[PDB]
Symmetry: C2
Subunit: 392 residues, 2 copies
């Protein structure tokens, strides 16, 4: 039983701790496959011709594509999608005409939302789960973090059951089941995690897509932050203590309140690192300042916030890239990796999943520290005319 | 049915709107008394020798004190106190030796707390409400706000119910009843408020253990007033802590903060918070205030403004020269209360609160505006070198 953290690193990002490159891990996954692959992906932009192609950064992507064909040359790719982005792409059509069984859940139909989950279960015995969705930009042109597990076959299905929840929906005239039978019921929640020298469990969201025995991603995040007693390391591309894309906008403090409660009532030192990528919302910035203002070393309250700005350089060719897509958190006890950002939708409307495991915590510790003391992480007052994010 | 708001203004200067002086209105109240007065007070220190300071501003204080004897010379005074402050004062003994019935509720024994309520019900038909407890400093050397009601008796017994709760727990070895009988039950809560003056009004008590059936707790009253707000919220409390106080394990407490920010964000409500600054205030309060001020973003229709009210000393008189007033008003209603905004006042410490709606709400509007757009109110980033408040 092995679990490895995987990291996708674009141009730059220099003696520092490092993780295993994600592209080799994906080649890894497609190589070990002997029987079947099950895919949950937000969108599919893997070939390049779907978007501008003259960057030459694309190979890591379509080389990966050929590996897919190998599984279809060896005789079952099972993909699931959403009210998808990059509709011009023909990857799913190619794989369906080549032998892959694909249905898309129109999550907007059911809960106004989207399928933001991105995970793999291969041969029923290996799993991948992380922030890297189906995109070559997620392989070479955006920072990504994830985790992959092999051998542990008795836990490998533990995300398949969710994958299968997604599978049952998306059929024509599909309806939300008010109760999932024992087939989709889970036995690996927060109360009883896995065993083997770590312990781990998965979580799904939203509640309507959570069968019995499934802990919600919100509850997993809250429990991980509550169990923290010295530090809370959070890295999400966007952080909004508010609901998004809801006709009446409403405040949403539960995550924020838990952060501040950990900082104050238990003296936990908390640092929050959020991404800036030319597409972020400037309205996000005041809330971060509202957290940063809590800092007071004389009262044992330690709240520090920074923004991770990655430079576009000569690569303005790629439009939806040059961000920190990684989403994770670590406390001295546990390590949570997630697919969802920190806003109301991911816990009320849009599908998402999250793993939490318990040296791996120290590995992610040093990953975050390298991503935090770095030169691309800047404080709130560092306007920096040469920096390339929108702040107002 | 008449209601007048009363304001105590020390040696300071406000052409500005004004309210009825508190000392003369209080003397009025003791004059109108014919049968009985019931007093709930935090402490009793009205003479100079009560705290041993030789200031002639105390005379008005002792003037009121002398009036008490007249009422007891006219044949009745009933007072209830707490694990009280200024224990050197002998006022309660003086009134007791002349015919006043006094018992002390040992609120520290029962609910961790103190009796912070300050109100009068006189003749069962006139009432006083305010932040001004029994202190001559509250008559001449500290900013105070309150409200008095005449000829509207149907609310006077509703406050007599809470007074009688205090009375019954004032007996020796008294224990909190898990159920208050129908005698203490109230019929004038927020859901059915009251109906001279074309107004509607109601009272609220705290903590829950001292709230009989039909009584809304002050927490719910504040939350309802902020929730019903649609265009603005004026808040003025001497101290504002989104945290517990005097609580052995400190924990965060976001309930009022969440509302203030939920009102600001989800409904575009303009929010201004005015807190008192004195030589004894807690510097740790300031970061949390920034957490509100950082919310400000005119581009997103969120309006959060904070200032601090500092009155200059000139001190000889100890534990004075502050803004001890606590109230809030929205374009619909006006709540004035006896408790500051921190967890204790809504879980442990006794407090009461009036809220009325219909010109009185507009009266409080421009009263606060005279205090906000004012001379003694300064922003967080000012911290002028010469005034007498603690910032670090």
């Amino acid at each position: 039983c092995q679990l490895v953290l995987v990291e996708s690193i674009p141009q730059d990002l220099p003696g520092s701790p490092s993780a295993q490159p994600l592209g080799q891990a994906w080649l890894q996954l497609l190589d070990t496959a002997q029987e079947s692959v099950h895919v949950a992906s937000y969108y599919w932009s893997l070939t390049g011709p779907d978007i501008g192609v003259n960057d030459s950064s694309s190979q890591l992507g379509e080389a990966l594509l050929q590996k897919l064909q190998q599984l279809l040359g060896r005789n079952l790719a099972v993909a699931t999608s959403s009210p998808t982005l990059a509709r011009t792409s023909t990857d799913l059509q190619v794989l369906a005409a080549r032998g892959a069984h694909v249905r898309q859940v129109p999550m907007g139909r059911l809960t106004r939302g989207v399928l933001h989950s991105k995970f793999w279960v291969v041969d029923g015995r290996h799993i991948y789960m992380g922030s890297a969705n189906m995109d070559w930009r997620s392989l070479t042109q955006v920072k990504e973090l994830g985790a992959v597990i092999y051998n542990c076959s008795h836990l490998a299905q533990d995300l398949e059951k969710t994958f299968q929840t997604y599978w049952v929906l998306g059929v024509p005239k599909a309806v939300l089941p008010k109760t999932w039978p024992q087939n989709f019921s889970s036995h690996f929640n927060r109360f009883q995690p896995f065993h083997g020298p770590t312990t781990a469990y998965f979580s799904a969201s939203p509640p309507a897509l959570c069968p019995q025995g499934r802990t919600r991603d919100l509850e997993a995040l809250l429990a991980v932050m509550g169990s923290a007693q010295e530090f809370i390391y959070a890295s999400v591309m966007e952080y909004f203590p508010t609901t998004r894309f809801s006709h009446p906008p409403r405040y949403w403090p539960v995550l924020d309140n838990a952060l501040r409660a950990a900082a104050f009532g238990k003296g936990v030192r908390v640092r929050l690192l959020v991404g800036c990528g030319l597409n972020t919302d400037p309205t996000m910035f005041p809330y971060l300042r509202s957290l940063q203002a809590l800092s007071n070393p004389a009262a044992n309250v330690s709240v520090d916030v920074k923004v991770f700005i990655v430079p576009v350089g000569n690569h303005s060719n790629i439009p939806f890239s040059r961000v920190n897509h990684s989403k994770f958190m670590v406390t001295e006890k546990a390590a949570y990796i997630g697919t969802s950002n920190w806003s109301e939708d991911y816990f009320s409307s849009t599908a998402g999943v999250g793993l939490v495991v318990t040296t791996v915590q120290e590995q992610l510790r040093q990953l975050f520290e390298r991503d935090w003391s770095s030169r691309y992480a800047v404080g709130l007052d560092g306007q920096a005319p040469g920096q390339d994010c929108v702040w107002q």
